[PDB]
């Protein structure tokens, strides 16, 4: 039957975790169709003088391959 592909992206944001996830998905939507689900693999980030600099959310994004 149907076949899906999963790609691993890292979304980033200074604002928070949801914003980082949304950034990855917004970029994926620019070029990929039939985006269906995501899976967070890791949460990492950088540190600056005020604490978190960048939140970095590593996620897999699954999409249906067209026929």
């Amino acid at each position: 039957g149907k076949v899906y592909k999963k790609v691993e992206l890292v979304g980033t944001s200074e604002e928070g975790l949801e914003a980082a996830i949304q950034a990855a998905l917004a970029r994926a939507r620019k070029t990929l169709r039939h985006l269906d689900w995501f899976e967070v693999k890791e949460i990492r980030g950088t540190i600056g003088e005020a604490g978190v600099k960048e939140y970095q959310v590593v996620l897999e994004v699954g999409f249906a391959l067209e026929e």
Copy 2:
């Protein structure tokens, strides 16, 4: 000594991660007593027109068992 049970729930929300966790715990409190801690096992979700459609947080919820 005391014995606990852990149950695996999936909370969902369109709003965010915290809201998804809170939804699972609010449902658990309707029928379970002595809810003590949770552990997030996975964060997953669905995708729609605006990016995230539903955040889905898979968590274990630990509660103390009453004596029989």
Copy 3:
């Protein structure tokens, strides 16, 4: 080359996940210099009458060792 150290902290907050992460980092910067990155190992928490009582984020914090 240079050497880094990683320490494991648990930040807590009633407010949310980001707040718990920031609490750990704020404590770290009181005494540690050259804080560079973090890795979330676990998200846990406690439960009370309002649902989540404390969010607890277990993270590794990496920093460069001086000299």
Copy 4:
């Protein structure tokens, strides 16, 4: 929003892996509604004089909780 529960079952069969999975799901269907997805956690089994005696498939079954 909606809340799901996951339960861990072990389906067994002398015939094969699919039969073991189907046995677990058939039993779940007797008493649970809104069964949605499954995740295989482990494949194990017993050995007899002719090789595999019983295939044992450990799986999580997710279902939507009714309101």
Copy 5:
């Protein structure tokens, strides 16, 4: 064929690891039948003035489902 259910319990005891496991299994047998095997998932515990306060053993318990 036969179907088993696994449940995740946490047994606790001040006395030791075996005692913590036994506490979980004793509670399980008050209400569950055909208990067959267990799997330890984690060993944790709390700390007090004299070292270990409670040993806490997280384990899966498997039991055969009755058939009707």
Copy 6:
């Protein structure tokens, strides 16, 4: 020496596990050359009226990269 790429696909089938794997590989062969090995990462699926609706096998597929 040689360099390979691994891509993560999900094959699906109503028929079984082997059929789901085969579906992923048949699709991969339409556009990729030098397909060499696969690794099953997960087995998942959906549930319907007759039990399993779709078997979903998540696998990594390794292929040798051609020189540029």
Copy 7:
């Protein structure tokens, strides 16, 4: 009490997963007694013109030690 040993084998078959498992167990029983249980560790395989060339199932086989 009694003691068991576990050995790691890889069964292969062009036919399917069950056949690969059975091939490993058939080889094991030629020389090992008191074969009791198996645990699948990995499912892998090779690819050729027809899709799957060989299914390869990595499993642990547990047996009771005599005496």
Copy 8:
């Protein structure tokens, strides 16, 4: 340099975890020399009327090859 072998055994005991580990090691020493270290991989067991029937400790045993 020196090469070690690891084998995976499962010791059992009705009494406890240490006894199960010791049972595996006692059997290993009957036929294997230069036993050096062990690693517990899993703790499992069976259930009976008294609670635990058998503790089953799965462990890797490392020994120096002669």
Copy 9:
């Protein structure tokens, strides 16, 4: 809110697992305050003429950080 630190210790004992855990915690309390919980990461050991020589329990110990 409150911040905790985790440190990784290895307790050892010829006597058993509980004794090895207790040895790590006894040493920890000589210098660390507000010790709260532990997590066993690994159980390992050495072998001698009579079987187990030393039990070695690798554990994480969590403690609440004092606020200055």
Copy 10:
């Protein structure tokens, strides 16, 4: 903010582990820009008459996506 892509490669070399990693990165830089970091996932290899034939290093490579 900025978005990165990770791809999983397997570099190989008869010479050693570093050479296997370098082979993957050399191939990646022929076609990918803004390569930033890598993560080794597995070390494997093949065996021949004289011991190691090929070292095989499975690694994730992260690169920053260009923005338009």
Copy 11:
């Protein structure tokens, strides 16, 4: 079809990682035939006055079983 066996060895060397792997494989080929692949499970070692004393590479070695 064909059946393989995997055995777990630890190669050691003062020189480096490749040398430790090669030591395990050199010993394996003294007694085992049809050695095909290896998988590194762990890299560990001992420490002495000058840093690394022994590199210790824990690996699985797979070989094809002869058919009688």
Copy 12:
């Protein structure tokens, strides 16, 4: 009995994995005594024009507490 501490360090080197491990251990020996064993947890690194820029070996270092 005896108690050990483990600390997690990241050694780096442009040259290779062994050199990165040795850098971490050389730094540890400046201030820590009774260094006994290490465990590699991760191998990561950065990429530059020459391929690898820095190898980064994350390792646990175990030492006996005095």
